[PDB]
Design goal:
It is classed as unknown function. Six copies of one chain form a homohexamer. Chain A is mainly β. In chain A, about 5% of the residues lie in helices and about 50% in strands.
Chain lengths: ~170, ~170, ~170, ~170, ~170, ~170
């Protein structure tokens, strides 16, 4: 059984409350897909004489696709206004034998809706893409052993605003 | 039963009266599809020292596709002349069990036809794309409960001319 | 029964006499398809202080596709020479129950062949695309009632050379 | 029966003798397809005060596709050297009931091979595209009546080097 | 039987320990595909008067595609931070009758993760592309005789940082 | 029976010895496809007053696709180093009834590997494209009569370094 599901929750002063009725994500947004891109310009053939490298990594926006729903106008206005959210969390699920597993969890700190792109076609459920831009990110991947049983998590992080491996927006 | 339908009405001094015979949209335009794009350039890693952020959101034109019909020359001339309409309303429908639901309603204030792109091919019903540019927008999404019964509406808005969350073109 | 047909007639000093044997369009060109584009740059968020707006609409060429035939060299030479035609008329037909209807009629005033693009492939009837550029246009769409019976025509027009809604090239 | 065939003959000091064994085109090149493009920049909304218009038409190269054969190295060298040919003739054939008809004939005056693009793939007969650039062109289209019987030819021409409707390279 | 498999191991201060349970690559990353590009600008029609040629080869990043797994956040952070690895080794396998053969082995010296591009779609196993940039490379191709039996290896190398055929990053 | 085959031999100080076991090409590289492009900028509507034309032909690299094999690292290093080869020969074969014919032979003088682009995918035999840049070329096409029996060869040539029809790199 496929048990794929992705859920998003906004946490800030402005509310983007979703429609999900999943017991573990009541009021979260249900989304269909996710894509990202990270690009590091640092040279492998030149090095700084000292401890300062000018360039830094570029993180692209995280882009999600979702069905149009009651959260859509909320996203459209939030994008237009440039409202900042303290945190956004995204949980990713897949099948794990008899129950699902949250294999990936992403937390974004100091977040804006950078784009929304809605369409209604003649055929098919209407959908929109939306992008998120952020100051810091914490990624957690949940491992399992050969029996599919949960082993330890791998947690990594990056602060674009501090240029350090921290889940922190401020200095 | 699929009950998809999109209807557009122009409201201004210049008439773009449509062909629809739908009881609830007599004389509106029937259209086939819609697409939009909203892009916010605001940074998540830098902030203004004060309360002024230079950049603002960019709303792309709202683009509709429709069959060529008697409104087509009206659109072609309105686009050519750059006539402004006080308001344009778009109603979006889908199935809701035994009757249809208007799941999305968009009102645009101070509107121009920014483009029209008609084609007649050897095969298929002739169609055209047309785009609308506007000073302000009000979006209403009509929610339903788990039984499909109407719950409360979500209404949001944005004024490009005022740079505020208002359905107003003028200051 | 599909009764799709498009006919073009050039009216000027230089003759581009066609091959059609249709009783109502003897010697017109038979063409297969048509495409156009109209783009209005006027802003919806800024307005002139006075009555003058700098920019004007851009009409793209009207582009037609036709089978290669005896008119082809006539088009190739007319395009090369830049001959101007006083008028070009295009009639568009579709089925209307037992007889066809001219649903769209376009008249172009002060017209040049702006491009011709012929091909002969290994397979298929050879065809060419050709484009027309013009000073003014009159568009007529022929309406029908719910019984398919002719109702009134919708006629609109635009003069690119006068920047007014007129079917006139000269001032 | 399809009787499609295109034949090309070079006429100049440098020989590009072909492989055809067709009785009417012995030693011509057999080619598979042809494409061209003619673009006229003249405005329909502005006119010269006098009798001089600056811009002129742009004729693209005539591009042919053919199987690789013994003429291929001849084309490759002629293109490399920039050899000029006094004339190149191209005859185009299609079915006409019981016999074929030369529906199109093109003569090019003062001609260069402007490009050659050969490929050998794992599958399929190797082919190359080649382009011809020229000073003047004469196009002849052979008409037929409703019975398919030959009627009169349509002959048109253009000199790029003289900017007149003449089949002449020199002044 | 297809026995295709590609394995990657990072060797540096920062750990990117993988998930593989293959007996010969325990804890390596399993990857699905690889692509590269090498471009030499040196002219064949001009030569230096002396022994110095200005330009040098450009090696593109080596790009791998892999399933998302517990190493993914490790790659995302390593790319973000620009961590350098002393060495990365990649082993490539295919079938060789009754057992597999390592037909290609690549060692990269002084290596950075230059890009990572993860996606989760509605359908299909989530994957990411990642790119590696490096100072030097050693390529080993393992040959076999007509009986499929191992013959001698072909080993070649290049140092981008020294511009010589050496597997060395430093001078 | 298809008897398509392409073989390449490098002849220079640096060895790029191939894997072929074909009796007539022992140790040559077997390749799968070939593509080229030759472009002549000379005008057909303007001519030099004297005997000097500034521009010259541009030959693109000759691009080959081959399976990855033991020659691959040799190509990768040769490209990286910019090694020059005195000559490279390419023989092209197709079926000729009961035996194959070498229909095309290309010799390149003073040659560099200008690019190599290898890929290993999940499915399919790994392949690479490689390009060759050169100072001169001799092309030989082997003709046959209507009975498929060998007739005379057509040999043509071009020197990019001398700008003459010669198979010579040096002056």
């Amino acid at each position: 059984a496929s048990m794929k599901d992705i859920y998003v929750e906004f946490r800030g002063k402005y509310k983007v409350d979703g429609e999900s009725r999943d017991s573990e994500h009541k009021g979260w947004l249900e989304v269909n897909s996710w894509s990202h891109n990270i690009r590091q310009p640092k040279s492998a053939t030149s090095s700084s004489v000292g401890g300062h490298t000018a360039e830094r990594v570029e993180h692209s926006d995280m882009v999600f696709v979702k069905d149009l729903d009651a959260t859509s106008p909320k996203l459209w206005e939030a994008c237009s206004a440039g409202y900042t959210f303290d945190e956004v969390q995204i949980d990713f699920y897949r099948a794990n034998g008899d129950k699902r597993i949250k294999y990936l969890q992403i937390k974004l700190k100091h977040v804006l809706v950078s784009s929304v792109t809605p369409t209604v076609n003649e055929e098919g459920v209407p959908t929109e893409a939306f992008g998120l831009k952020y100051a810091a990110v914490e990624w957690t991947y949940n491992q399992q052993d050969i029996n599919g049983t949960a082993k330890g998590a791998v947690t990594k992080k990056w602060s674009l605003s501090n240029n350090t491996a921290s889940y922190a927006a401020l200095a």
